[PDB]
Amino acid sequence: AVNSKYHHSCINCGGLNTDERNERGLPCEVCLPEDSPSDIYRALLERKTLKEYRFYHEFWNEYEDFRSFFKKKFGKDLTGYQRLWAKRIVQGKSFTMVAPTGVGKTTFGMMTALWLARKGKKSALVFPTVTLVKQTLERLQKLADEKVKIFGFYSSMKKEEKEKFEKSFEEDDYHILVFSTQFVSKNREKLSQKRFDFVFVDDVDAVLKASRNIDTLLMMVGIPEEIIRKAFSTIKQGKIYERPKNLKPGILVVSSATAKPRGIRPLLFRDLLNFTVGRLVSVARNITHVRISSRSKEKLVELLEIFRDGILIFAQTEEEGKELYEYLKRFKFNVGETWSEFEKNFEDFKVGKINILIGVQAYYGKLTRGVDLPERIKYVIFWGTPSMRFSLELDKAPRFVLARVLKEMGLIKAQENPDVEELRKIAKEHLTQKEFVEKVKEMFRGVVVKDEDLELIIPDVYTYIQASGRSSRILNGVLVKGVSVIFEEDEEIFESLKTRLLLIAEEEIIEEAEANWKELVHEVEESRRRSERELTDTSRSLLIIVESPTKAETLSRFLGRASSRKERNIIVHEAVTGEGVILFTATRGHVYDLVTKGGIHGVEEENGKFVPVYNSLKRCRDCGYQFTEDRDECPVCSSKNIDDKTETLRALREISLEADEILVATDPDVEGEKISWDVTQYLLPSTRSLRRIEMHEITRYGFKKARESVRFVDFNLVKAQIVRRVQDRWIGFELSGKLQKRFGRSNLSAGRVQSTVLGWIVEREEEYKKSEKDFTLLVLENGVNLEVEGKIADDVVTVVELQEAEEEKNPLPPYTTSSALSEISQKLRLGVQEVMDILQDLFEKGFITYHRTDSTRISLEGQNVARTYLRKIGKEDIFMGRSWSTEGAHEAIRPVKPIDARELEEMIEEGLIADLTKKHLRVYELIFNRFLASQSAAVKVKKQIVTVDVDGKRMGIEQIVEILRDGWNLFVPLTVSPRFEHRTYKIKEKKFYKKHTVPLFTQASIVEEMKKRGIGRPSTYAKIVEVLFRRGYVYEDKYKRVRPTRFGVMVYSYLKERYEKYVTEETTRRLEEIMDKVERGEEDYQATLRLLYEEIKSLMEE
Ligand SMILES: [Zn+2]
Ligand SMILES: [Zn+2]
């Protein structure tokens, strides 16, 4: 409902269609003239136009055929997982089965094989054991009819059944063949021969013990080994491989990797059949973590009494675990150890004879590789934090400590050296062992440094997450709740565990007094038995579409990348949720853009209203040029290796068919809303289940809270974006074209705002040179320096009036985009564009809120982040609750997690979090300190206002003298000027000089200025400054100040002399304000476009 036009948007003819028609899910006016047909298919047919809309009809029919068949020759309706797998099965696709514990993969395999046998297509079912084969064939024979032809083979075979199998295999008289992995290994040739239209593998790792079996599988679905070798030759080289454009493969469906999918051969499945076979990962965790202040066995016995059945104790050493077992053996609890009688105690605990099992870390970790039954374990008890300890003596040298400390201290060399080498190097320069330890204390932050026993303790957070994760999984539908209890007295180790757990899993560990045990147990058991009612059908498939690959990686990092479909142009990850399956993919940028072909530079004019015409975007991966026109080579470097976006759209359409509900998670500004509307509009004639998300963080919390306020696409944001872009295209092209006649170059003016800023910078030079006054600086005895007007020579300052007061200095509000860009690019020696890239890299990596904001407002959650950090840091006295603003489009720039820069450094150097450079950490530090200083207590200060007399002139100075009560003073430092007595102060030196009273522009002051003047947006600032820079209108001198170039001065002079009315501030501000009003739906859209046109209509005449 924006009345625009998209170029590859017709679903039937594959051509161009309008906004209003794809919104109504219709083909173009050419394919179907009338507005309301009773049925698109038969209408397209009745007008000899039906073309690619056939595929969708055929799809839905031959899907619900599968559905009705499954419902008939089996129980009832499909579950979500089966619904998705079915929708992928009719399109002949291959994929691993992303699902949790026993959802009926074998059932789906049998049913699909049977349904395919109903056509003439032949399938093959592969199983890990030679016993499950028999069970499968049994459950199959009675399930089939007279029609189907099923067989099989194993080790304990019959007499004539063997030769029955061989003979029926010799001349293709089958539809279904059910054999073991043993058969795939042994009879490799026979399988390499045939071509199956369906290959089902129940156990992936059972077959992955031999590359021969991978190659055999690929040669089973119908791939020649020559292609296979020519792909192996590519993946071994490093890069990824594209397959033949029109090659028909068979269907391969497998389970998940029970273990580690090691090797490089598996990658073939990603390049030949377009699916990844990763290990099944589940971040689906519903757990309450509770900590108990000490290892008191009374508390242990009480808890054991409350939990009763399903308890698991983890000890650190085998000795204290032994002692613990000894203690618990006296209290008639049914406890079993794992260090002597293992299999008996495990297979007892597996059934229910034993109620409490005690294991050591490594023991259980390695010996559980067999089974690991989750339905029994409900409570996990830790007798001490699962940690990793290192020696802090000179010898017994840990390499990373030595590396860090030496790199900071004296003999820093390269990036890495041998262990004993660093040992011998630090055996020299260090002061003492004690000084070494102190250096480790100062340097290392985020770990525990026992300088008493010389021990470096680092909480094994991964171990803790697996072990804790034993108490909560997806069982028969419901994410059953669990309880993890830690007995840790060392407060530091607890703090470390808390921040690491909060970082990686976003999970709070609560204290004992805040935990109501009976309630927790009730929860646990209630959900547990609730997972037995067998409704097991809330399963849905979800699709989240984002425009940046980075958001996708950091989405996989908390949703859990299981498999990855190489879908055409894009890559789509799937994961397991509590409510089914989730699919998330990246767009890798914009999709459409204003074509430059027709009308007014692209915007056509029909029916008295303007209509933007969009076309798919193409980026050259070789040079970098972006273009709209549909061509074979790059219109700059003539390369065929171009990345198209219409491909991305086709992929998104097929994916759209395969899912249940679609959410579009583009960023929460106008730009994101446009990419959103392009996508939804293009997808709408495919599925009616599309909505918008607006994530303000990339975290589980951001995801959830954004899904809470899920809505449909807001059109005023779209209209605003379109008006903006149309202005930039119009004034841009026009002025650029006027300058093409005076300077020769064809790519100059990029808009009005850019030329306004150039106006400021260029006009600045003369007023900077102008207002250069002469000053003198005098430093006083028992006083600071003092800058006053020049030529004074009585050599004495006389205090006239004196007054002192006590005042509470509030802190500065949190960084908005302007504040952030300005003060960060000022403090660090960085340009605004690099700072913007950093902020974006921090937001998309889930470390801060939205970096594009014009509001200092902060949520109660953010305040609570401030409080949890102040509480952790030991200074929660100075916490304050300032929300700063009521009016806020978004929220200010704050961190999402109460973790400082140093702690993050530790996490990086260690290996928890990844992909952050020193600059990222510095910027994050700045945002952190700013935000905390915001939410910290006002500093109580004693300040004075001295009226001094110099050369008969009365000058007033005003200085903060005493900090009588601390506050945000610990984050953003505050200085004190020495006290001024009411006497005469002699002048020590009268330094006569001069500085210019109107300073030039830096990049920071440019952003600050166009913020003050209302000339720009949080998304335009750094784009503007960098536009001026890279297009050679501005240079940065020795003091990193912004000065105009000769080119710039000439250009702006031409602009001012010919077109001043169209470029000066007040017009840019008026249009900015007007467009803002358009965004809120206060100002008409077509009317403001009309305004822009009418004012461009006169620029064409000048
Ligand atoms: Zn059409
Ligand atoms: Zn190119």
UniProtKB/Swiss-Prot annotation:
Per the record, the similarity remark reads: In the N-terminal section; belongs to the DEAD box helicase family. DDVD subfamily.
Question: Residues that bind Mg(2+), according to the entry?
Answer: 547, 667
Q: Which residues form the Helicase ATP-binding domain?
A: 86-241
Q: One Pfam match, by short name?
A: Toprim
Question: By its UniProt entry, which SMART domains does this protein fall under?
Answer: AAA (SM00382), DEXDc (SM00487), TOP1Ac (SM00437), TOP1Bc (SM00436), TOPRIM (SM00493)
One Gene Ontology molecular-function label: zinc ion binding
Q: Where does Zn(2+) 2 bind?
A: 620, 623, 634, 637
Question: What PROSITE patterns does the database record attribute to this sequence?
Answer: HELICASE_ATP_BIND_1 (PS51192), HELICASE_CTER (PS51194), TOPO_IA_2 (PS52039), TOPRIM (PS50880), ZF_RG_C (PS52037), ZF_RG_N (PS52036)
NCBIfam families, from UniProt? Answer: rgy
Q: State a GO cellular component annotated for this protein.
A: cytoplasm
GO BP annotations, alphabetical order: DNA topological change
User: The motif DEAD box: which residues?
Assistant: 202-205
CC cofactor:
Zn(2+); Mg(2+)
RG C-terminal-type zinc fingers: which residues? 617-644
> What is the first-listed, main subcellular location in coarse terms?
cytoplasm
Keywords carried by this UniProt record: ATP-binding, Cytoplasm, DNA-binding, Isomerase, Magnesium, Metal-binding, Nucleotide-binding, Repeat, Topoisomerase, Zinc, Zinc-finger
Q: How does it assemble?
A: Monomer.
Q: What else is known?
A: This enzyme is the only unique feature of hyperthermophilic bacteria/archaea known and seems to be essential for adaptation to life at high temperatures. It may play a role in stabilization of DNA at high temperatures.
| Catalytic activity entry | ATP + H2O = ADP + phosphate + H(+)
**Domain Helicase C-terminal: start-end pairs:** 299-521
From which residue to which do the RG N-terminal-type zinc fingers run? 1-38
Q: What does this protein do?
A: Modifies the topological state of DNA by introducing positive supercoils in an ATP-dependent process. Increases the linking number in steps of +1. Probably recognizes regions with a low GC content which melt and form a ssDNA bubble, allowing the enzyme to bind and cleave the DNA prior to strand passage; the bubble is probably cleaved by 2 reverse gyrase molecules, one on each strand. Positively supercoils DNA with all NTPS, although it strongly prefers ATP. In the presence of non-hydrolyzable ATP analogs it partially relaxes negative supercoils.
What name does the UniProt record give this protein?
A: Reverse gyrase
Q: Where does ADP bind?
A: 74, 77, 82, 102, 104-107
Compartments annotated for it: namely: Cytoplasm
Q: Where is the Toprim domain?
A: 541-698
